[PDB]
């Protein structure tokens, strides 16, 4: 179990469970409704949402926690592009949940890279 290179998957499932519980995740749980928000695709090239991230992890389509972290960061960078105004309550929600995610993902990434370095050396 020390330096287990697969432990990040369960850690990421647990973190996504916390994120889905957070009231701040409500706008980001499901894809933006493309048929009902007509100008969304005029602004955003690559939509992303937490249900898509959770399904990608479950399907085994992330090779590392860094790939999962890239998709989650796209959720927040898309929100900042579409809702850029610091006055907006949606801007505030995105910033709070981004900080929460970045705090909790830190140890998952550091542990995973430590494990990589250990198995590569040995």
UniProtKB/Swiss-Prot annotation:
Residues forming the Bromo domain are 3-108
Tell me where in this chain the PTM Phosphoserine is found. Answer: 2, 92
Q: Which residues does this entry mark as bearing Phosphothreonine?
A: 46
Expressing tissues: Expressed in myeloma and epidermoid carcinoma cell lines.
Which superkingdom, per the lineage?
Answer: Eukaryota
Q: Where in the cell is it found?
A: Nucleus
Instruction: Say what the protein does.
Output: Probable regulator of the insulin and insulin-like growth factor signaling pathways. Stimulates cell proliferation through regulation of cyclin transcription and has an anti-apoptotic activity through AKT1 phosphorylation and activation. Plays a role in the regulation of cell morphology and cytoskeletal organization.
Record text on subunit structure and interactions = Interacts with IRS1 and IRS2. Interacts (via bromo domain) with acetylated lysine residues on histone H1.4, histone H3 and H4 (in vitro).
Give the record's disease field. Answer: Chung-Jansen syndrome: An autosomal dominant disorder characterized by developmental delay, intellectual disability, autistic features, anxiety, hypotonia, obesity, and dysmorphic features.
Descriptive protein name: PH-interacting protein
Give the species this sequence originates from.
Homo sapiens (Human)
Lineage here is:
Eukaryota, Metazoa, Chordata, Craniata, Vertebrata
Q: Which residues of the full protein are shown?
A: 1315 to 1435 of 1821
């Amino acid at each position: 179990m020390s330096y287990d290179i697969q432990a990040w998957k369960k850690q990421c499932e647990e973190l996504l469970n916390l994120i889905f519980q957070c009231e701040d995740s409500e706008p980001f749980r499901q894809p933006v409704d493309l048929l009902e928000y007509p100008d969304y695709r005029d602004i955003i090239d690559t939509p992303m949402d937490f249900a898509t991230v959770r399904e990608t992890l479950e399907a085994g389509n992330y090779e590392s926690p860094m790939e999962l972290c890239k998709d989650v960061r796209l959720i927040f960078s898309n929100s900042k592009a579409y809702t850029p105004s610091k006055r907006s309550r949606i801007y505030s929600m995105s910033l709070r949940l981004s900080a929460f995610f970045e705090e909790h993902i830190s140890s998952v990434l550091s542990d995973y890279k430590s494990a990589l370095r250990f198995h590569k050396r040995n």
